[PDB]
Amino acid sequence: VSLQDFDAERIGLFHEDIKRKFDELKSKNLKLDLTRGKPSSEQLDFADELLALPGKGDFKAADGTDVRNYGGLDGIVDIRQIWADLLGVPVEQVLAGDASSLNIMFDVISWSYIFGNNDSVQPWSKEETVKWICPVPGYDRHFSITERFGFEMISVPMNEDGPDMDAVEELVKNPQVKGMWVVPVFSNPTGFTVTEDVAKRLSAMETAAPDFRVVWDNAYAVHTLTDEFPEVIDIVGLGEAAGNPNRFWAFTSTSKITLAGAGVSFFLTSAENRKWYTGHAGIRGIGPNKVNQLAHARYFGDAEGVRAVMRKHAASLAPKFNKVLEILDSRLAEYGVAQWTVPAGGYFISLDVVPGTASRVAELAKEAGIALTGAGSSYPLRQDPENKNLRLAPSLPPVEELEVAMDGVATCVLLAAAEHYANH
Amino acid sequence: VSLQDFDAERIGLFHEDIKRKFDELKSKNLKLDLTRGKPSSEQLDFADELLALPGKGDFKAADGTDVRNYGGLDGIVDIRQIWADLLGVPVEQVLAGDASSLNIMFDVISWSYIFGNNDSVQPWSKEETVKWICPVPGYDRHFSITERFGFEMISVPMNEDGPDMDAVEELVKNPQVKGMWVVPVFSNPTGFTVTEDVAKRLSAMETAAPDFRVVWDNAYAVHTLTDEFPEVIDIVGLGEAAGNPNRFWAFTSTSKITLAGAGVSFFLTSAENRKWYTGHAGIRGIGPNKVNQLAHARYFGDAEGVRAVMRKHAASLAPKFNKVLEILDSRLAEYGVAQWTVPAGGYFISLDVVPGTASRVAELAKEAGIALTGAGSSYPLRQDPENKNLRLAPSLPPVEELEVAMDGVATCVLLAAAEHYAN
Ligand SMILES: Cc1ncc(COP(=O)(O)O)c(CN[C@@H](CCC(=O)O)C(=O)O)c1O
Ligand SMILES: Cc1ncc(COP(=O)(O)O)c(CN)c1O
Numbered sequence: 001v002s003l004q005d006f007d008a009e010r011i012g013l014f015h016e017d018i019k020r021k022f023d024e025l026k027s028k029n030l031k032l033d034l035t036r037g038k039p040s041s042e043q044l045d046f047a048d049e050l051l052a053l054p055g056k057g058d059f060k061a062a063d064g065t066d067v068r069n070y071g072g073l074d075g076i077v078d079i080r081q082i083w084a085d086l087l088g089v090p091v092e093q094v095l096a097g098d099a100s101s102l103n104i105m106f107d108v109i110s111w112s113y114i115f116g117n118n119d120s121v122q123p124w125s126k127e128e129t130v131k132w133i134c135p136v137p138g139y140d141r142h143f144s145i146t147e148r149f150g151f152e153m154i155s156v157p158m159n160e161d162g163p164d165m166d167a168v169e170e171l172v173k174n175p176q177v178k179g180m181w182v183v184p185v186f187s188n189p190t191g192f193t194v195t196e197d198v199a200k201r202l203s204a205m206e207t208a209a210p211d212f213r214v215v216w217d218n219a220y221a222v223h224t225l226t227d228e229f230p231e232v233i234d235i236v237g238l239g240e241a242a243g244n245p246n247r248f249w250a251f252t253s254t255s256k257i258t259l260a261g262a263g264v265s266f267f268l269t270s271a272e273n274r275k276w277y278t279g280h281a282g283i284r285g286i287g288p289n290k291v292n293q294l295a296h297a298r299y300f301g302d303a304e305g306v307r308a309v310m311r312k313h314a315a316s317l318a319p320k321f322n323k324v325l326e327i328l329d330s331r332l333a334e335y336g337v338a339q340w341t342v343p344a345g346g347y348f349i350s351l352d353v354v355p356g357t358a359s360r361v362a363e364l365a366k367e368a369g370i371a372l373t374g375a376g377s378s379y380p381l382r383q384d385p386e387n388k389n390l391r392l393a394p395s396l397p398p399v400e401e402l403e404v405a406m407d408g409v410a411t412c413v414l415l416a417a418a419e420h421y422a423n424h
Numbered sequence: 425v426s427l428q429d430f431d432a433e434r435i436g437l438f439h440e441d442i443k444r445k446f447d448e449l450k451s452k453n454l455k456l457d458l459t460r461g462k463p464s465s466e467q468l469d470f471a472d473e474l475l476a477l478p479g480k481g482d483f484k485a486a487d488g489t490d491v492r493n494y495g496g497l498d499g500i501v502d503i504r505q506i507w508a509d510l511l512g513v514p515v516e517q518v519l520a521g522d523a524s525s526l527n528i529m530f531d532v533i534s535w536s537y538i539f540g541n542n543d544s545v546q547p548w549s550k551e552e553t554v555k556w557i558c559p560v561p562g563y564d565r566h567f568s569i570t571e572r573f574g575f576e577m578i579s580v581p582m583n584e585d586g587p588d589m590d591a592v593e594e595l596v597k598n599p600q601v602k603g604m605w606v607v608p609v610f611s612n613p614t615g616f617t618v619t620e621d622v623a624k625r626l627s628a629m630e631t632a633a634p635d636f637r638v639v640w641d642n643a644y645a646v647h648t649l650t651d652e653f654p655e656v657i658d659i660v661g662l663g664e665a666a667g668n669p670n671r672f673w674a675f676t677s678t679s680k681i682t683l684a685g686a687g688v689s690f691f692l693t694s695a696e697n698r699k700w701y702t703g704h705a706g707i708r709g710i711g712p713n714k715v716n717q718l719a720h721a722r723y724f725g726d727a728e729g730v731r732a733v734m735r736k737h738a739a740s741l742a743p744k745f746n747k748v749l750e751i752l753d754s755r756l757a758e759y760g761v762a763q764w765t766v767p768a769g770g771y772f773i774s775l776d777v778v779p780g781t782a783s784r785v786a787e788l789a790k791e792a793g794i795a796l797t798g799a800g801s802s803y804p805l806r807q808d809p810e811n812k813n814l815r816l817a818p819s820l821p822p823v824e825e826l827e828v829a830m831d832g833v834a835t836c837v838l839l840a841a842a843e844h845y846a847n
């Protein structure tokens with residue numbers, strides 16, 4: 001019997017039962033935080049050597065470029081080739097920038113707004129209405145960019161195999177629709193991964209805008225919790241094979257590989273998109289930081305060296321995800337109140353509670369000293385129309401803290417659920 | 425006697441002889457380049473240690489920030505404080521970014537275009553026309569930004585004490601005029617420096633646009649050729665004192681101090697302007713590279729450490745400028761065909777040849793295997809109305825290459841001048 005099927009008296013009694021547990025939780029005086037989607041100090045210690053790279057006297061890229069001096073908008077060959085080898089794409093596809101792929105995403109959108117992109121009839125700023133497809137739950141920092149530009153964000157469901165392509169294929173037939181966000185591997189926060197079939201559909205679909213763009217933000221391209229590395233779909237190639245070569249603006253970075261905020265970002269896109277991008281980037285400045293790129297190339301040495309680092313991250317993160325999953329199972333399984341993802345990579349667990357109660361869960365957790373990301377944080381304009389979803393970030397705290405925190409979260413889920421069904 | 429005073433016969437003899445020298449110059453099959461203000465490899469060697477910084481286990485800013493992890497839009501206190509001490513301004517003024525100050529200049533203009541700035545009634549995108557004041561000769565990369573945005577660029581002279589303030593103060597009465605570029609110390613390329621009097625005028629002037637900005641791009645703030653450091657006007661403080669606190673967007677960087685393209689940039693501006701900037705920069709991302717900032721703070725230690733580095737730069741650069749000047753003096757002075765700047769600092773010499781002949785000089789030089797910046801490159805849209813100015817960049821080549829290259833340039837100046845007078 002799930003809580004929702006409890007009779008009026010049994011849910012009342014269940015409410016009194018669980019409230020006693022919530023009282024016990026508050027008497028612990030906790031100060032715990034499950035909101036930080038960032039690496040732990042242990043993980044950051046793995047790249048300690050990179051703080052001393054590339055090192056005295058070592059300042060030449062593989063083509064002879066003196067990385068210490070001005071020039072070159074594309075990034076250095078050394079790091080571009082490593083990433084090409086890692087991702088299994090031609091090196092010509094890869095541009096290496098500064099430490100933020102979000103910076104590049106914002107820029108390409110900004111420039112499409114000001115100038116148009118290379119396929120634009122006119123700049124997006126001339127449009128009365130720009131719409132933008134948002135698979136949900138999704139990444140708040142993506143949705144913030146499109147909200148700051150005033151684009152009308154239209155949500156679609158992020159499914160186990162990727163965005164709902166029936167919904168996307170329909171929405172792109174509207175010429176107001178200029179692009180979409182996706183995190184295609186271990187998606188933030190669902191953990192879901194775009195299948196080959198879904199990528200093919202994104203690559204082959206017809207769009208009403210001539211200048212429509214998919215942001216394929218492959219932020220977790222190698223970020224497994226297991227021994228297996230996920231498939232890297234060559235999405236730019238698929239777009240090329242389908243006759244839509246310019247469709248995909250693809251990104252990734254080293255921010256959760258080396259140093260979070262001081263890594264290297266990558267922008268993978270078609271020949272014509274790269275010329276457009278570097279033509280605008282060359283007015284914005286002289287080019288990206290080559291020294292940090294050489295440092296990175298030296299640290300990894302080759303693509304296998306990147307995978308070796310990713311196995312260390314996996315070994316550090318796995319027990320944290322396992323604790324969270326173990327607690328959710330032991331406390332909530334019998335009650336039918338919640339569903340949670342079981343991800344095999346990435347940085348998050350996505351928790352759906354009773355619809356109408358997510359904001360109350362986070363409020364109760366706060367009263368109990370446990371910080372949860374707010375209700376709607378994974379939705380455009382922070383509006384989850386079912387008030388059900390919560391994002392859990394296991395990476396930073398030690399396992400002992402995750403145990404305590406999640407035990408409390410689970411009590412909060414139950415109490416909120418008991419309040420909700422008792423109020424019917 | 426100047427070349428213009430030679431009679432037909434004498435200028436014909438001079439022309440044949442300089443033409444022969446030019447032919448002899450081309451026969452050398454040179455491949456030399458005076459176009460880019462890049463530090464030499466000798467200069468870059470000075471920061472060899474920075475390639476190993478901040479070093480293993482050293483990753484906390486002075487306020488405890490772990491520089492290896494996300495967050496913080498302002499840059500770390502360690503580097504901000506050193507720059508504040510260096511420039512003699514309150515640390516609160518200083519924001520520290522990534523490796524390019526141009527990126528930030530681009531960004532603040534693009535955001536003013538898109539969103540408006542904090543003093544704007546509406547985005548500049550909604551204006552029929554945006555005008556922008558450009559002191560000349562000036563910096564090509566500044567002008568390129570405002571060209572790319574469609575802004576109509578209005579030239580004013582860059583004089584020895586700064587921009588022509590009689591002209592600026594008149595132009596700013598037009599509300600279409602939204603801002604201005606300046607390089608205020610050892611200016612690119614004139615070497616000229618804004619005086620306190622001119623700075624005060626810029627701070628007090630009345631503008632018709634409510635959201636007018638001066639870009640005060642102090643790229644050469646400490647970049648002495650003589651070991652005497654120039655005055656650092658606290659320009660943000662002067663705008664605040666005049667009652668126009670938001671007027672100045674000030675910049676500098678370490679690109680010609682440490683590593684060119686892998687240094688640290690700074691943005692100095694008012695409290696309201698910083699809040700506006702970081703508001704937008706926080707949507708563009710999570711914030712700048714804190715590790716490189718700590719590396720820089722470790723490398724310099726303090727303001728005196730920055731000044732020690734600058735003295736090393738001066739020792740490397742000054743004989744290159746001196747050689748250029750010696751060649752200009754010995755080849756050109758007697759002929760009255762050219763004028764050039766004699767800078768106390770910065771990265772360039774500004775050369776004015778016979779009006780109507782600069783593009784010819786650059787074409788002759790290119791035929792001879794010597795790359796010069798094109799005619800008009802220090803002017804908006806590359807339009808020098810007198811076709812007289814050329815910029816020379818002594819920093820990159822060794823003195824031996826400078827000597828060969830500049831002897832060649834002088835022969836080009838003289839041939840172009842001889843052709844002009846003979847026609
Ligand atoms: C006035 C000025 N401001 C900024 C810069 C560069 O600032 P950064 O963006 O912080 O590095 C400069 C320098 N210009 C040189 C660069 C050489 C190159 O080949 O790229 C030039 O173009 O010659 C100046 O002058
Ligand atoms: C999907 C996604 N994309 C981009 C980023 C940030 O990338 P960067 O640090 O290179 O800006 C993050 C950080 N969590 C993320 O989850």
Ligand SMILES: O=C(O)CCC(=O)C(=O)O
Pocket residue numbers: 036037038141494495710
């Ligand atoms: O920790 C931060 O400042 C934001 C990090 C973030 O967006 C993420 O890693 O998902």
